[PDB]
Symmetry: D2
Subunit: 171 residues, 4 copies
C-alpha cells in the first residue's frame, strides 16, 4: 500500500447528462410569384393567387435546406412548387378580414383560413397606388400528409404562416 | 378593383415551426479533495474517499451553474458538498477492476459501482511514484431523489460519471 | 467444464427500451355560470360573461384533477374561479363571427379571440326561444404565466378551447 | 336583443392540451438457441453462443411486433437472426463476472460487456447438474446503426438487455 495526492491540474471530476431543448425554425421562400386584386374603395381582396418555388427555401442553414427537398419532406424533384388560391374574402372591417383558400403542398390540397390584416392603403410618391398587408394562420402537417415519417414529437404538427406583403399598382 | 405587383424587396413569404433537439450537458467540479491508497505490487485500491464542493460546478455557462445550486437541484446552502466513499475494490486484472462505494448527494446516500481502468503506474522524474486512472459509471437521478421537480423527459434520468485522475506519492 | 441445454420454459431472452408518446388531455368544467345576450334579428351577441369554478375540473382522472388545483397549476385556494368577459362581437355572417374578450386565469388577464359559430337559432316546443352555438380558439399558457414550472416540452404551450352551448330564453 | 340561460345538460365548457409521456417497452424473443459450457469447479463460462430469431419477438402487442420486422427496424427478411458470441469471461468471484462477446444485429457487429450474475449452481432431482444465471448490460442503437431513421428523442438510444437463464446438463 502507498499514499497519493491528486495533481488537480491534470485531474478532472466530470459528468455528462442528456437534455431536450425546444426551438423555433424560422424561414422564408426567396422565390415566388403572385397575382393581387384589391379594391381600396371597399377594402376587399378580389383575387389572390400565389406560387412558391420549394427549391428557394431558406432557413439560414445550408444542409437543412437541402434536406427539405428530399422524400421525407418536400420531394421538390416531383413537386417543385407549392400554391395558394383565394376562394373567398369575408370582410371584418377595413383593417381586418378572414381569407379562405386552397393550399397545395406536394400535390395534396386543403382549404385554409388566413387572417388578413391591412397594414395601410396609400397613393405613392408618383400618385400610383400602394398597399401593405399581412396574412397569418396555422396549418397542420398532418392535414397535408407532410413529412409523415417525422414524428409529431420531434417536429411540431403546427406550421405558422406569416406572409408580409408590400405591393404597387400595375402597368 | 385594382391590380398590384409585389415589391419582392419588402415582401416576405415566411413560416415558423417548433422542433426538439437532444444535447449533452458536460461539466466538472473545479473544487474537490481526495484520499488515495493504492498498492502497485498488486494493483488494488485500498481506500478512496472524495469530497466535492457543489458550489464549484462548471458547465461552461454562468446562469445554469447558479441555477444548479437552487432547491430544484443541489440545495447548496443546506448541502454544500457531495461525497464518495469506497467500500470494496474487486480486481479484474492489473488494468481493470470493479469499485463499489457510497455516493451522497444532498444527504441522500446510495451504493454505486464504478469501472476502474488503470491508465498507468510509474516512478516519476524524481524516483517518487505516480499513477493515472479513471472511474466511470452511470447513476440515476431517481435513486437519489435528485431534481424530482424536473421530468425524466426534459432532463435524462441517467448521469454519466467520468473521473479522470493523475496523482503523485505523498510526504 | 460441462455442457448445458437451456430449459426454455424458465429462460427469458429479454430487453427494455424507453420511448416517448404524445397524447391529448381532454377535459371540461362541471360547474360554471353565464350571462347570454343575443339578438336573433341580426345574429349578434350583445353581452357574454362566463365564470368557471376551477374546483369543478374533470379530465376523467381523480389524481390529476386534484393536482390541477395545486401551486404548479390553478392555485384554486387563492384563485377559485376563472372568468371570461366579452368586449366586442364582430359579425362575419349569420353563422360566423369573431368574439374578443378578457380571460382571467389565476388573476392574470389577457384579451383573447374566439371563433363563434352559430349552430342554429330556433323557437322551441313552447314558442319560447332557443340557440345553439360554439366558441373555439387557442390560448397560450405563457401569456397567462400559467404552470410556469412545467416546461413547454412536457406539456404544450397551446390550450384549445372548445365551448359548446345550448341555451333557452329567460323569465 | 334577448336573454338566455344555459341548459347545463347539453352545454360543455371544454379544453384539449397536448402532453408527452415516457414509457418502457419491455419484450423478449420466444425463439432462440444456445450453447452453454460452464465449469462448476471454478464458476467460469467456457463458451456461450446464442442465436435469436428476430421473427419471434414479442412486446405484448401485435402491430408493433410486425412493425419491428420492417426496414426502419430489424429487416428480418434479409437478416432473420441476431447472434451473440462469447470471447472472454473475466471472473470476479463465484457469483459475479464480466462477459465480453460479439453481438450482431442486422449484419452489424460490435463487442459488448454483459454482467454475469450466477443465481445458483446445483445437482438436480436426478443427480444431473443444473445452473441458473443472468446476463445484463446496456447497448447503444447507434453503435449498430439500428433504426437510424427513428430519432434518439422518440425512442431511446439505450437498450437494456436482461437475459435470465435456467439450464440442465447434457446427453
Ligand atoms: C472540468 C471541465 C471543464 C472546465 C469543461 O469544460 N468540461 C467538460 O466539457 C467536461 C466533460 C468536463 C469534465 N469539464
Ligand atoms: C425570408 C427570411 C430570411 C432570409 C430569414 O432569415 N427569415 C426569418 O428568420 C423568417 C421568420 C423569415 C420569413 N425569413
Ligand atoms: C418474454 C416476455 C414476455 C412474454 C413478456 O411479456 N415480457 C416482458 O414484459 C419482458 C421484460 C420480457 C422479457 N417478456
Ligand atoms: C365535460 C367533459 C367530460 C365529462 C369528458 O369526458 N370530456 C371530454 O373528453 C371533453 C373534451 C370534455 C369537454 N369533457
Amino acid at each position: 500500500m502507498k499514499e497519493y495526492t491528486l495533481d488537480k491540474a491534470h485531474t478532472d471530476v466530470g459528468f455528462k447528462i442528456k437534455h431536450l431543448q425546444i426551438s423555433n425554425v424560422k424561414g422564408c421562400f426567396k422565390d415566388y410569384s403572385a397575382v393581387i386584386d384589391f379594391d381600396p374603395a371597399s377594402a376587399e381582396f378580389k383575387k389572390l393567387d400565389v406560387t412558391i418555388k420549394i427549391a428557394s427555401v431558406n432557413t439560414e442553414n445550408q444542409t437543412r435546406d437541402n434536406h427539405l427537398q428530399q422524400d421525407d419532406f418536400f420531394k421538390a424533384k416531383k413537386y417543385p412548387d407549392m400554391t395558394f388560391t383565394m376562394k373567398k374574402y369575408e370582410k371584418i372591417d377595413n383593417e381586418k378580414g378572414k381569407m379562405t383558400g386552397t393550399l397545395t403542398i406536394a400535390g395534396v390540397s386543403k382549404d385554409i383560413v388566413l387572417d388578413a390584416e391591412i397594414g395601410g392603403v396609400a397613393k405613392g410618391k408618383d400618385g400610383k397606388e400602394k398597399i401593405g398587408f399581412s396574412l397569418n394562420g396555422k396549418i397542420k402537417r398532418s392535414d397535408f400528409k407532410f413529412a409523415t415519417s417525422t414524428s409529431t414529437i420531434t417536429l411540431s404538427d403546427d406550421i405558422n404562416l406569416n406572409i408580409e406583403v408590400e405591393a404597387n399598382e400595375k402597368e
